[PDB]
Write a protein that binds this ligand. Structure first.
Ligand code: FCC
Ligand code: K
Ligand code: K
Ligand code: K
Lengths: 354, 146, 354, 146, 354, 354, 146, 146
């Protein structure tokens, strides 16, 4: 089946460049991202009035190329799925298409083609261009980004809440005080809501210039409350940044340990030894040919199953992290073993000589 | 593969070799005694770990329902297929689901409870090795989980 | 008292969801915050002139619903307090209402109802709406946020002061220099105070656009001093952010150790053993029936009191953190014990054989 | 519960069993001697810790005023009630002031200076256990601090 | 000299509150800062034209109070210096005034009084008000702030330089590209220097609004280069912030160790023992009364001097930090001592029995 | 060759100040950078129209001085290269000029001189002034800055991508929502592209003031989405800052260990011992005078080569970092050696007495 | 306090008790021998540390110029005054230049090479203790550096 | 310096002193036996390290092609010149390519497999020392790599 070898190898290669790429494989993914983003920008610029014509000109060609490329890639991937054994035969292929994101892609492609066909409610067919962004959201395998952000936010919830709370209080207070001062001279601060708009647009450091204090009392108050609260409104970024950096460093610290090792290697061995109980040449002898005392081989198999289950557990446990108190534990084990050794010397000296 | 009544009786006969007294339980004494009669030498802590994997009552024994469950299941469960496949993936840096015959041989005979040369020879013979010398271990895992 | 069982269990449940809720219980707390925040925003928008009518329209209904819900919750909580034994009978209930925040809530509720009743100095009755924000400040149990912020600020005081000091100096200097350059050409920089206003609004990165340099000398000077001092005016946020992140990580480090353990478990045991000296069946025997030699049992009790006091101390101590020098201490103990063991061998060999 | 003069005399008679010489002090010798006569076996470091809990003079002795204070107070003080309640809360993850009868039994017989089965049986009998099997330990703390 | 006791104690107290304030002593220092700062703000506001009158009104009174208070404090401090023995008698007092900052203060005070007296070149007498800020700079004992900032900047020099370099490059490039696009349509971008001004005022996130791109090509280019380079122009703050936080934490880590201890205590003992060689009653006996063999006591003193010098060195060294490799060193010492102990057993068994 | 000594020493000194400056050597380097910067700014200001004359006035002189100084420095450096032995004689000199940056400098200098000569397409000769910036880029020896930035960016890629992704999503959404609200009342938000421009210029915190929301619904939406997303658009700076700081600290941690040591010292010794096999007086004896049994000395040399190769490897390895698990490894070695020692005692006691 | 020639001769006579052979040097042998004759028992490492404090040549000896310098200087140098004052400041938390008589007594008799009761009694007598019981240690340092 | 055939024959004759049996290989036995005959005392782990530096087959032997390569190359390769120069640079803090004669002497006789005085005397004689006493070690490295 040599040619079958080459077929399967190629299949696996393409499936790898699609499902999970490394090195040069990521180059194809970058090209796909550039295509979607260019389509998006062209659509946005099409929204303008002065540039509608050239925008639609370029958009027609780009959208056609996009539809063709993505249809082709969908077909090629659903085929390449053949490598893994799970999805073999049309049975397995259909099982594959049951995936959520695969059906999402097929829907998006069919919809794009239907739009272009209807091209020959035009405004709705336009608005439906925003769907492309799904081809970007899909790159996030299992919402990894959302999960990471959520974890890091939850871990620091206390500090974030403190920052937001104190900042909100300072904002209320400073807005009120400045409003009191500029109420009459300046027309911007007509009402309290205006003062609040000013306070937000200042403390955040956006600073439109819409409203600014005109009277010197207002200016001194604003300078003070700014140099006091601007730091509060900028904490969340700093807190989350340090959180992310520390998490990355600490993780990269766990990888250096390489603690899991030995358990994965032993599991394959216990599984092979159990499996080979029922097919090894070691059991194809006149001695083992089962007729007089079947239980002996069954008992031997039962022992290998128990050892397999011990190895599977030890293997799953390796994933869990380990503390730095192991050194104390090895000293405890080492001291105890040695103290017991001196006792065994002492008892033998006391036995012979007394 | 519905568990039949004759299969249950053959498991019962093996279970009774351990529990020779008819008490309906296997302790470290019964398990370790049968094992050492065959020339094995487990430690006490290894006998406790083995019993603990199937002892739901937590009293240090295996009863026949627990014994029958373990024997009927072997490695066919989905947890076993996933964990064995995860163990191979430790040694698959490419992430393509392949491992070299020579790399499999090194890991099997140099790490853990090392396989003998003859054991590892039978293991590489049983995997349908490609002409390059690369092993698709996920189909190797399904043959041990079938 | 089975029904009494169910009564007490329900009471404890509600008191838990109100007093110190966790997990899914927080859903009720989030709803109360949304109701208060909506009331606030409606009031603010009522301040505007063009929207006064619809604002008051919605505010009437919202304020009524608010008064009813908060009165009901107050009554329910003051009842639910019954679970804990401290506040039993009207005696204990009143003892409960003595709390500061409970009386604060009762005052706010009575005041809101009085305002709505007077609805049938209208401007003062309006202004009194700001009181609602107390229902938000109360969520902070024992000013936790303020205390956390204060701790972290105090720990870093030196760096914060350095940043503010150097920044203030750079501001003074750059303002003076730019004023010197734009004094005549541009009308904005009429006086030094104007140049200072510009300098603040510039270095903070607010940038209203009120005043900007017009002459190229001023523009070069501003570019230089900006790309020099903008970093100074943004340090406090970075310093405090890293401080918070490091503190969180280090704390989360202590939890993994789980050092306190054993002391809490032993304290309950020493307390039970002391208590049982005066009621255990172990002392209800003819032997213990006290008439001839009362002191024997008293001496036994005195020993249990001393052990209880040792266990209470060891329990309180566990809360205190421990250093990483324990490994050196265990080696010192282990080496000393072993070196003493070899001496005891040496002395016995020298005793028998000499 | 004003301390009466007859109660003081009974404390004095117990104090004199330790201080048999009439020196007015209890050292590790006097304390440990009475304890070992009853079949207890404290270590020297345990006898020093016990005396140190009530020795304000710091000279390694207990005098009668310190002895009387300890005996009059027992566990009735507010510090004792709070710390005992804090110890239960270590084992109350829900934060609802409850602990399971079975969880109390595990902690009492498996951690620390483990209670015997009979000790822990008397302890669970004395707590007014609910029908579910959950113990309100804060009312258990007030019974030991009353 | 009891009254002399009370005199000296009071003297030391005031000298402590002035020279080394701690706790409540800092309250007096905060009040002085409030006075100097109020004087400064009043002067600045005096610079304005519309507020000159009231400004000078308040400034007269404030400046008079300032001169009186600071003269009084100077006299009181130069007196209180008497506590320490270094400055006793007018000799020591003058030695004290030789300090740099003390002479600086005296100069500032004399100058302020001369200005007020001349009040009865008025513009120069005005301008000389800025001298007050020296009374603020003096609070920094030995330029601690500058030294801290310099240390932390030097330690990270590489990253800071990288950030500034890459940011400058991005600025040059983006300015050029946008200028190319807006050159004709928009009048703001008349020349390259204008484009550079825009680029700085944008990438720094100041954003005056002076010049903004008008043509859509310019807007897309600006959006891209902003969302690319704004992070570069904001790194220095983040880098320095994390540096300060980490340094503080690590320092606070050294304090827990308390390693120096024992050396300081032993130094005082070796110094006392050496000193007492020449005055102790231990040497005032017929035996020691020196006439026949003077060298014996001299030799005993020479030994105490050598031990004093060993203790002074061990004491000075304690200040130096120590590594975490001490545990390996104690194991090396412990193992070697034990291995030598088993050898001494082995040799004795081989000696007696052979 | 004493004078030759002085010549070579001077040569090495200048080559060190130019090629690898350290300490006070950097003073010359700062002057060269300052001169290059002065030329750039003058050119830029020459771009303006109102200042063209004085700009060219100063530029002529500055450019002439620049050409002379850089030509002189080039000649002096290409000469000073003589110190190192690699480039001796004109052969080695030319080999030196083969360097990339050296040829770059020579090209820039020749081009500058050609421009000034043509001074006596003037616009192209102008535009060619930007080449000077190469004299700044050259200071980066082997693109150290780019490599550092790339490493730190790659290590954190996941967090950066998460921040950019979530920020982009929030931007899209908030822009759409605000556009919906201001579509009619305000003229700025004419089309969707305008709303996107506003969204970027706000969320980045630039805040030109070009377009701002006018209707209160738009203002509330903008306040919300700002206080939500401004932190997202500011993460990259915080993440990268903490990354740089942590990397610097951890590196400075490796230097304290000083682990490499001993290997470098031993390598020189094994190399000297191998070299001296063929020239040492130890081999210039009648015994070694090779004629009867040449192989003996060859075998001795072969052993020294093998030891040299072992020492070279151990030396290269020292550069690699080492883990903190060494303490466990020394305990394992120490325990095993001691446990084997007690066994050797036990066997001898059992041998003699039995 | 110019070093006079008779003072130099008295130092020379002490130096010659160590260097009895007239070799012009003091090694650990000569130093330690004189010390043990007086009933002291330094270790070898303590004798090396002592010689190393004044051995500029680094060859493990003290010569007469080094001996004379040490004897002429005693503790009068500014380095000694500063370091001794820094040692007291370790135990001055207030920062006011004071230490309690009772705190000085605790540190002198409980840390380091503890002073005997009689030694520490003479030390507290020699400091002009204030009526409160507080010692100004900076004037105590000048009396030892005079 | 083309390797000639007579040079190859002289290497072969040295190789045959190790491999006296004519098996074409040098193991730790053959290498260590010749070394100890000359009075050297390598350990087993040192003999394994030496063979491992040139054993490409990884079977613990040196064959003649590997032996010839090592002997023809000595230290002349560019890797040797660079690493030796990097070792000197460890002790050149100035970065100017110089090291003091006295500093070279300290490192050679006090670190590592210390040179004897006579060895280090020959080494400093062979470097063309400057009149100051500073050694240009990069030309010292080229003399050992020539
Ligand atoms: O050094 C450390 N240890 C540690 C050292 C010796 C013995 C035991 C423990 C430790 C333990 C838990 C978290 C962090 C640490 C650090 C750093 C580290 C370095 C490499 N890999 C993991 C971590 C930092 C630290 C330093 C000083 N004080 C406290 C913490
Ligand atoms: K900004
Ligand atoms: K801004
Ligand atoms: K603006």
């Amino acid at each position: 089946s040599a040619a079958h070898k080459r077929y399967r190898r190629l299949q696996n290669w393409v499936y790898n460049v699609l499902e999970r790429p490394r090195g040069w494989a990521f180059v194809y993914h970058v090209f796909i991202f550039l295509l979607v983003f260019s389509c998006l920008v062209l659509s946005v610029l099409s929204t303008i009035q002065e540039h509608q014509e050239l925008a639609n000109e370029c958009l027609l060609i780009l959208e056609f190329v996009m539809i063709v490329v993505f249809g082709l890639e969908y077909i090629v991937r659903v085929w390449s799925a053949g490598c893994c054994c799970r999805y073999r035969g049309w049975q397995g292929r259909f099982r594959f298409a049951r995936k959520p994101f695969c059906v999402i892609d097929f829907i998006v492609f069919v919809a794009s083609v239907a739009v272009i066909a209807a091209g020959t409610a035009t405004s709705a067919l336009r608005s439906m261009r925003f769907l492309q962004i799904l081809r970007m959201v899909r790159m996030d395998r299992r919402g990894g980004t959302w999960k990471l952000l959520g974890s890091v936010v939850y871990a620091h919830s206390k500090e974030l809440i403190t920052a937001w709370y104190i900042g909100f209080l300072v904002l209320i207070f400073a807005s009120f005080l400045v409003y009191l001062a500029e109420k009459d001279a300046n027309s911007d601060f007509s009402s309290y809501a205006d003062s609040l708009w000013w306070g937000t647009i200042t403390l955040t450091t956006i600073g439109y210039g819409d409203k600014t204090p005109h009277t010197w009392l207002g200016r001194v108050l604003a300078a003070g409350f700014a140099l006091l609260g601007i730091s509060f409104f900028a904490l969340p970024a700093g807190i989350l940044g340090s959180g992310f950096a520390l998490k990355v460093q600490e993780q990269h610290r766990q990888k250096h340990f390489e603690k899991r090792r030995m358990p994965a290697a032993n599991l394959i061995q216990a599984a092979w030894r159990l499996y080979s109980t029922d097919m090894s040449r070691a059991y194809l002898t006149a001695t083992w040919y089962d007729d007089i005392m079947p239980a002996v081989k069954t008992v031997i198999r039962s022992i290998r199953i128990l050892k397999f289950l011990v190895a599977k557990r030890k293997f799953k446990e390796t994933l869990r992290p380990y503390d730095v108190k192991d050194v104390i534990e090895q000293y405890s084990a080492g001291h105890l073993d040695m103290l017991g050794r001196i006792k065994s010397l002492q008892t033998r000296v006391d036995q012979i000589v007394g | 593969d519905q568990l039949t009544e004759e299969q249950i009786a053959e498991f019962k006969e093996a279970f009774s070799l351990f529990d020779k007294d008819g008490d309906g339980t296997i302790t470290t004494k019964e398990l370790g005694t049968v094992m050492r009669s065959l020339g094995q030498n487990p430690t006490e802590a290894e006998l406790q770990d083995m019993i603990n994997e199937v002892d739901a009552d937590g009293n240090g024994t295996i009863d026949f329902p627990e014994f029958l469950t373990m024997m009927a299941r072997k490695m066919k469960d989905t947890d076993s297929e996933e964990e064995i496949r995860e163990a191979f993936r430790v040694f698959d840096k490419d992430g393509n689901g392949y491992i070299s015959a020579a790399e499999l041989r090194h890991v099997m005979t140099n790490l853990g409870e090392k396989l003998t040369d003859e054991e590892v020879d039978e293991m590489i013979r049983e995997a349908d090795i490609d002409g390059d010398g690369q092993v698709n271990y996920e189909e190797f895992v399904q043959m041990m989980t079938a």
